Enzyme design. Structure first.
Site, short mmCIF file in Angstrom:
data_model
loop_
_atom_site.label_atom_id
_atom_site.label_comp_id
_atom_site.label_asym_id
_atom_site.label_seq_id
_atom_site.Cartn_x
_atom_site.Cartn_y
_atom_site.Cartn_z
N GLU A 23 -9.16 -1.39 3.78
CA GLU A 23 -9.66 -2.16 4.91
C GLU A 23 -8.82 -3.44 5.14
O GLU A 23 -8.72 -4.31 4.26
CB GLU A 23 -11.14 -2.54 4.71
CG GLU A 23 -12.10 -1.36 4.66
CD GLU A 23 -12.34 -0.60 5.95
OE1 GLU A 23 -12.11 -1.17 7.04
OE2 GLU A 23 -12.79 0.56 5.87
N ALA A 25 -7.92 -6.84 7.90
CA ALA A 25 -8.72 -7.95 8.45
C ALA A 25 -9.51 -7.55 9.70
O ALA A 25 -10.61 -8.07 9.90
CB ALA A 25 -7.82 -9.13 8.76
N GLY A 27 -9.84 -4.05 10.66
CA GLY A 27 -10.16 -2.63 10.56
C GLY A 27 -9.44 -1.86 9.47
O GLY A 27 -8.71 -2.43 8.67
N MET A 28 -9.64 -0.54 9.47
CA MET A 28 -9.16 0.46 8.52
C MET A 28 -7.64 0.68 8.54
O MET A 28 -6.99 0.58 9.58
CB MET A 28 -9.85 1.78 8.88
CG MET A 28 -9.66 2.90 7.88
SD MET A 28 -10.72 4.25 8.38
CE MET A 28 -12.23 3.78 7.52
N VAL A 29 -7.09 1.02 7.35
CA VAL A 29 -5.69 1.36 7.13
C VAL A 29 -5.65 2.78 6.59
O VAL A 29 -6.37 3.10 5.64
CB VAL A 29 -4.91 0.36 6.22
CG1 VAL A 29 -3.45 0.77 6.05
CG2 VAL A 29 -5.01 -1.06 6.75
N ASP A 139 1.59 -17.36 4.82
CA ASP A 139 0.68 -16.64 3.92
C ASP A 139 1.46 -15.75 2.94
O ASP A 139 1.01 -14.65 2.61
CB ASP A 139 -0.38 -15.82 4.69
CG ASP A 139 -1.61 -15.48 3.84
OD1 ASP A 139 -2.36 -14.57 4.24
OD2 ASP A 139 -1.78 -16.09 2.76
C1 LIG Z 1 -1.33 -2.26 2.71
C2 LIG Z 1 -1.28 -2.32 4.20
O1 LIG Z 1 -2.27 -3.02 4.80
N1 LIG Z 1 -2.08 -2.95 6.20
C3 LIG Z 1 -1.02 -2.23 6.38
C4 LIG Z 1 -0.56 -1.95 7.76
C5 LIG Z 1 -0.38 -2.99 8.66
C6 LIG Z 1 0.13 -2.74 9.93
C7 LIG Z 1 0.47 -1.46 10.29
C8 LIG Z 1 0.28 -0.42 9.41
C9 LIG Z 1 -0.24 -0.66 8.15
C10 LIG Z 1 -0.45 -1.80 5.13
C11 LIG Z 1 0.77 -0.98 4.91
C12 LIG Z 1 1.91 -1.01 5.70
C13 LIG Z 1 2.94 -0.21 5.26
N2 LIG Z 1 2.90 0.54 4.15
C14 LIG Z 1 1.77 0.47 3.45
N3 LIG Z 1 1.76 0.97 2.20
C15 LIG Z 1 0.69 0.75 1.23
C16 LIG Z 1 1.24 0.57 -0.17
C17 LIG Z 1 0.68 1.60 -1.14
C18 LIG Z 1 -0.83 1.57 -1.17
O2 LIG Z 1 -1.26 0.33 -1.74
C19 LIG Z 1 -1.40 1.74 0.22
C20 LIG Z 1 -0.31 1.89 1.28
N4 LIG Z 1 0.68 -0.23 3.80
#
Ligand SMILES: Cc1onc(-c2ccccc2)c1-c1ccnc(N[C@H]2CC[C@H](O)CC2)n1
Length: 343
Positions: A23, A25, A27-29, A139
């Site tokens: 999650e 700030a 929404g969902m990832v 940040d």
């Molecule tokens: C964490 C995370 O939190 N938000 C995002 C995100 C932000 C904008 C667009 C797409 C993803 C991400 C993101 C972005 C690119 N790669 C990844 N990789 C992670 C790293 C490995 C795991 O912890 C979960 C996936 N997350």
């Protein structure tokens, strides 16, 4: 529409086979398979249109991430949204799927000096570009540093990023702040709004110390505890450093404290490279004016194997951009994401 945890995640037919990540700030990832570029990608769902501050943070970050183009800064591959402002409730930002963040890596993995040296080089190379664009990240922390399977590092999350404003940096003692507590420069708690480049260098210093011991160097439990963590290692500030603080309340708080001695860096980190500790000292300098700048950190002997200023690009065009209502911001978000629409 594609569903995840009983919630809508319609990233259309281009992106399929979704896996929950966490999650964010707004929404969902999720991770997904990009059927066009034939690779898995990371996608974040953002629903910020009910509040002005969430719109400002979303627009600011989209604006910055779309103008920036740098190997050590995460790019936006695609933005998914409805074709009309009326039908648009959510925004989906697509980025390259990174293996991990420096947060998760530091919890279970010992970093060799080679890995520490290479990670710091990439952080500062990315930061040099950010700062040349007159932007402050504000940040910087290990979870905002992503890494792929070959250790390529990319700075992410510009949700708290501002255009640098050093002339309007002053404020009173104990002024509230939004950035993650443990990576906050001492001056935040004293007299600064975090509108100077020196605020990011402090956070990088904290990250360097965390990489050397796998533990945050100043884990303050609350607003004022953070300063007492910093002073417990740097020791009491000098008369010169206090003289630079004109705010009486801030200066007198520091004066009221018993004398604290400096903890030697080689005592905190006995296995660290001596050049790494000399650079750490210059980044974790109490006085913001004497704290090293991003380009001088890159020229430091610790980063000699990598330093190449002709291979450390700067932004072509520095930035320029909250009182706007959420309605006007939604329209600006809609406009900013238009280039990604099929037509
Ligand atoms: C964490 C995370 O939190 N938000 C995002 C995100 C932000 C904008 C667009 C797409 C993803 C991400 C993101 C972005 C690119 N790669 C990844 N990789 C992670 C790293 C490995 C795991 O912890 C979960 C996936 N997350």
């Amino acid at each position: 529409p594609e569903m995840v945890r009983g919630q809508v995640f319609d990233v259309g037919p281009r992106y399929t086979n979704l896996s929950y990540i966490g999650e964010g700030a707004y929404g969902m990832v999720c991770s997904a398979y990009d059927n066009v570029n034939k690779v898995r990608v990371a996608i974040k769902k953002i629903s910020p249109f009910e509040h002005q501050t969430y719109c400002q943070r979303t627009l600011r970050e989209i604006k910055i991430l779309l103008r920036f183009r740098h190997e050590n800064i995460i790019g936006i591959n695609d933005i998914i949204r409805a074709p009309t402002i009326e039908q648009m409730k959510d925004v989906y930002i697509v980025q390259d799927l990174m293996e991990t963040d420096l947060y998760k890596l530091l919890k279970t993995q010992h970093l060799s000096n080679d890995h520490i040296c290479y990670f710091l080089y990439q952080i500062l190379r990315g930061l040099k570009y950010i700062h040349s664009a007159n932007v402050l990240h504000r940040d910087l922390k290990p979870s905002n540093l992503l890494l792929n399977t070959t250790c390529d590092l990319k700075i992410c999350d510009f949700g708290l990023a501002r255009v640098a404003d050093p002339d309007h940096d002053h404020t009173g003692f104990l002024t509230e702040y939004v950035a993650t507590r443990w990576y906050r420069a001492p001056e935040i708690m004293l007299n600064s709004k975090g509108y100077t480049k020196s605020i990011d260098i402090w956070s990088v210093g904290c990250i360097l110390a965390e990489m050397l011991s796998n533990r945050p160097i100043f884990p303050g439990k609350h607003y004022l505890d953070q300063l007492n963590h910093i002073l417990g290692i740097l020791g009491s500030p000098s008369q010169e450093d206090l003289n630079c603080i004109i705010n009486l309340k801030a200066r007198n708080y520091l004066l009221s404290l018993p004398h604290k001695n400096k903890v030697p860096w080689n005592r905190l980190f006995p296995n660290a490279d001596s050049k790494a500790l000399d650079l750490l000292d210059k980044m974790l300098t109490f006085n913001p004016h004497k704290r090293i700048e991003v380009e001088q950190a890159l020229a430091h002997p610790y980063l000699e194997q990598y330093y190449d200023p002709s291979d450390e690009p700067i932004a072509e065009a520095p930035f320029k951009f909250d009182d706007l209502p959420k309605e006007k911001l939604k329209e600006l978000i809609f406009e900013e994401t238009a280039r990604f629409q099929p037509g």
